[PDB]
């Protein structure tokens, strides 16, 4: 078996000459040469089995991944396990190999507002996909943002997503962790549970702030933190907005607090377009029901250079203890499998 730090890192023989890249969600990520497509590949190693939360995630990404196709989405270019569940204790997972994130290029690098609209229209194309599939990412933040060297943009980490349920979104105050913190809506810490679309538009927001600046917009430094930040930008929400809050425990934090006006974002980013101001703005609504939609999104001015909605396409197919879950795991990884 190869091994990379003194643990086990075993693909072999298709995959040699491996690098350590970093560590995943949990586990191991190297790039490799892969001896049947002459290509060097990322591969990031799973060892899911004991925790159940680790066999769902891997899960779930293994069953999307494998019916998404679009150019803006990582692939699964192929599988490796042992040929049996009971040798199976790890799960490699072999993608395009893709030379940086865009949470590494903005630490790094200034971006013009040509690479801003292009990287924006790219993520929001993907987005479309996954939007027409019924499916919530759930965690987008440029760390899960991969890029080349031509600055093609992909997709990646669908560990943390589900299937749209805007029926069954509500729920109570300060109770959600749904996202990384920085990339939250405001709703999660009021009455969400994350279930619909508009939780992906506020992180594509967050996002869009973070490369006019390199510096994350709503740098809350814990979780309660977070709406302080959010509130400090966009100022107090309006009467109708507070009207739609029907749980009196948020109603009343909010009402609570003394008036902020909004900070305007020429102020904010006095180098940005004007028109990339304008979709902020719309995708860092306070309200989700206001927040525009992808393919509103899409259609916006800013992205005029890009926009042609037939070559933005959507999903022809919309979408346990941990033992079963292995089983589950084992059968979906099955068509990689010498057979
Ligand atoms: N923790 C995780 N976040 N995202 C994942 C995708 C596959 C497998 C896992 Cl364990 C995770
Ligand atoms: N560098 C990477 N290319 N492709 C990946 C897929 C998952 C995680 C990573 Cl780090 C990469």
């Keep these: 078996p190869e091994m990379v730090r003194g643990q086990v890192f075993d693909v072999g023989p298709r995959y040699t000459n491996l690098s350590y890249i970093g560590e995943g969600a949990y586990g191991m990520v190297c790039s490799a040469y892969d001896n049947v497509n002459k290509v060097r590949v990322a591969i990031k190693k799973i060892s899911p089995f004991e925790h159940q939360t680790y066999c769902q995630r891997t899960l779930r990404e293994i069953k999307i991944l494998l019916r998404f196709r679009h150019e803006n989405i990582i692939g699964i ?9 009971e040798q199976m204790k790890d799960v490699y997972i072999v993608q395009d190999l893709m030379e940086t994130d865009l949470y590494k290029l903005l630490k790094t690098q200034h971006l013009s507002n040509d690479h801003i609209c292009y990287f924006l229209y790219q993520i929001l194309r993907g987005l479309k996909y996954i939007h027409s599939a019924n499916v919530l990412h759930r965690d987008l933040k440029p760390s899960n943002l991969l890029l080349n060297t031509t600055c093609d943009l992909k997709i990646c980490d669908f560990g943390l997503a589900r299937v749209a349920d805007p029926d ?30 508009s939780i ?31 509130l400090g930008i966009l100022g107090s929400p309006s009467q109708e907005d507070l009207n739609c809050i029907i749980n009196l425990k948020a109603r009343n934090y909010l009402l609570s607090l003394p008036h902020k006006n909004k900070v305007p974002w020429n102020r904010l980013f006095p180098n940005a377009d004007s028109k990339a101001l304008d979709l902020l703005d719309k995708m ?12 509103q999104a899409l259609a916006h001015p800013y992205l005029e250079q890009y926009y042609d909605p037939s070559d933005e396409p959507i999903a022809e197919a919309p979408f346990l203890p941990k033992e079963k879950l292995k089983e589950l795991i084992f059968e979906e990884t099955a068509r990689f499998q010498p057979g």
């Excluded at 270019?77 to 569940?85: K, L, Q, S, V």
């Design 200 to 230: 992906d538009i506020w992180s594509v927001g967050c996002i869009l702030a973070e490369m006019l600046s390199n510096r994350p917009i709503f740098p809350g430094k814990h979780y309660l933190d977070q709406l302080n930040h959010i």
């Design 168 to 197: 069954h979104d509500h729920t109570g105050f300060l109770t959600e962790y749904v996202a990384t913190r920085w990339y939250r809506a405001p709703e999660i810490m009021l009455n969400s549970k994350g279930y619909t679309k």
């Design 284 to 295: 860092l609504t306070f309200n989700p029901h206001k927040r525009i939609e992808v393919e």
């Design 77 to 85: 270019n192929d599988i490796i396990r042992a040929p049996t569940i």
